[PDB]
Design an enzyme around this catalytic site. Sequence first.
Site, PDB file in Angstrom:
ATOM      1  CG  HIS B  41      -0.331   0.259   2.514  1.00 46.90           C
ATOM      2  ND1 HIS B  41      -0.114  -0.740   3.438  1.00 46.90           N
ATOM      3  CD2 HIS B  41       0.108   1.405   3.088  1.00 46.90           C
ATOM      4  CE1 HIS B  41       0.447  -0.224   4.518  1.00 46.90           C
ATOM      5  NE2 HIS B  41       0.593   1.075   4.331  1.00 46.90           N
ATOM      6  N   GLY B 143       3.516   6.388   9.518  1.00 46.64           N
ATOM      7  CA  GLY B 143       4.832   6.233   8.942  1.00 46.64           C
ATOM      8  C   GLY B 143       5.602   5.029   9.441  1.00 46.64           C
ATOM      9  CB  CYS B 145       3.473   1.194   7.245  1.00 47.67           C
ATOM     10  SG  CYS B 145       1.846   1.608   7.917  1.00 47.67           S
TER      11      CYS B 145
END
Lengths: 306, 306
Positions: B41, B143, B145
């Site tokens: 993503h 952030g 991720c």
Amino acid sequence: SGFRKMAFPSGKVEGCMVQVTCGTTTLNGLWLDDVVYCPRHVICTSEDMLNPNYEDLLIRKSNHNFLVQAGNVQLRVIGHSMQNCVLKLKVDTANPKTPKYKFVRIQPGQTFSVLACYNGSPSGVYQCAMRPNFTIKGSFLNGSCGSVGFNIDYDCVSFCYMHHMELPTGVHAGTDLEGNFYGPFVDRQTAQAAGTDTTITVNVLAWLYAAVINGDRWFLNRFTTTLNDFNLVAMKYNYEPLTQDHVDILGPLSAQTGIAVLDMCASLKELLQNGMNGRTILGSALLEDEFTPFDVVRQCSGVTFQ
Amino acid sequence: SGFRKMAFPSGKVEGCMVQVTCGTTTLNGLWLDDVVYCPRHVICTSEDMLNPNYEDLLIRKSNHNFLVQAGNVQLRVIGHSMQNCVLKLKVDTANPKTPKYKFVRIQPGQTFSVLACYNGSPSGVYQCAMRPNFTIKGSFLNGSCGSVGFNIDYDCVSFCYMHHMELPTGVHAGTDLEGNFYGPFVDRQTAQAAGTDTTITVNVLAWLYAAVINGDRWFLNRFTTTLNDFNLVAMKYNYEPLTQDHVDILGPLSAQTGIAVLDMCASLKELLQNGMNGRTILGSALLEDEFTPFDVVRQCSGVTFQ
């Protein structure tokens, strides 16, 4: 969101841990530049610890009596000196992995990360705090001596603790990197009693602020209080007294959440008297005091490091 | 002595974290050899997350649309492919700091260390467990991720988790390093409900053994019980049922302390019914289930790593 007992990344410290052996004793050391720091009781035997005379024991030791080993690379000792309770073994090779480091002596209530090592090899990392009685509640086994506590400011590693001994009560005592013990402790195997282990009130307030940030608000009450009326209740439960300096440090957390420091104190005061009634705060049934206001800001804002 | 929530040293993982940017989105990636792994993503905008079609979004992306940055060194993307929910960006330069790594898919109840990162830069390390509902109770901000969970076996780093999303309930879900989510979760911004978060009974027993090793024995009672009679009481309090395999794993701890598994179950059963009556165990007023039997052995015996 979420809140965890978070430690600093230990990569920059892993590359500074070495194995120091002197006779039968083997413990860890801190290799920075061409100097290796280690507890001075590495020159003691199991019997010497009962009543050691470090000056006399050190005379019968030469540079070639210390075996400094970094992984499988052997270091050559060129000069040794005893500064307070630490030995400074000057070696011939500088550590290529030496980071921008700094020696600092912390105050009680501050937190730091501990890299537990054995035979110079890292084993684990955890966060802890300097208790008000100058002890730490760590996790150490035999051979862990020489492990260091540290903080990180962007790219600079601040060393603040070296582990030396375990007290008969199961708590741990050590020195700064200059060899000065925290508290009234000495490096000999004898009955040493620590004082009252009070709760770090400023840290509890910072933790309650973190709870409100993460959605736990049930403890917020409709009361307020004064700095004096709170400390009167705090001293009864063996809590550190709160000063104006502590209020100033909590300012940013007060601004972000919109809750005044004195109002949060009123919520804590209520909790100290009535308990938690089986409820939890941030997944804990006890009041946590191992987060400083800086730790909370750092974790609730995502501060990174080199 | 002592017992702490201990994480693995993160040095070997720090050198594998990079910054991945695709358009306006920037998250973390795992650089091993000449491949960089990151959540898919990263190619989505804030609006695309509501209902993304990753196949169609990926067509309008070329190799030169991904900015992989390692500190201040820029990596060149030579080929991209989507494996399940992760992107595999093949770069031109192999990571010189690539450790002996391994991809593993863990089971619920196992523990691992999380290296929280932001903009490819490490921020902190903490230990956590895979809950029985395939969520983790972590500490993540926007952030984070691409942060990875890992274990260490001597010199081998076992990667087992990559962080993907935060659920509306505040818990966290992610994938293994092959892109398969843990649990029935998908990488889109929609209401996803997790199941019952039960307690990992085998981990609680291991924690009680650690307590006895460290001097806490007040919970030891004079009773015993059967595996069936215990699970009958366990299910009532949303505890995972105990199997014979769990008994076999607790064998070593049973031998060291001289306390049979079924006897320890009788102590736990009593605690589940009567509570803890304001007492603590290892400094905690709740029953901890984020230590596996291996974690306890490792910490109570001093296992080191490369």
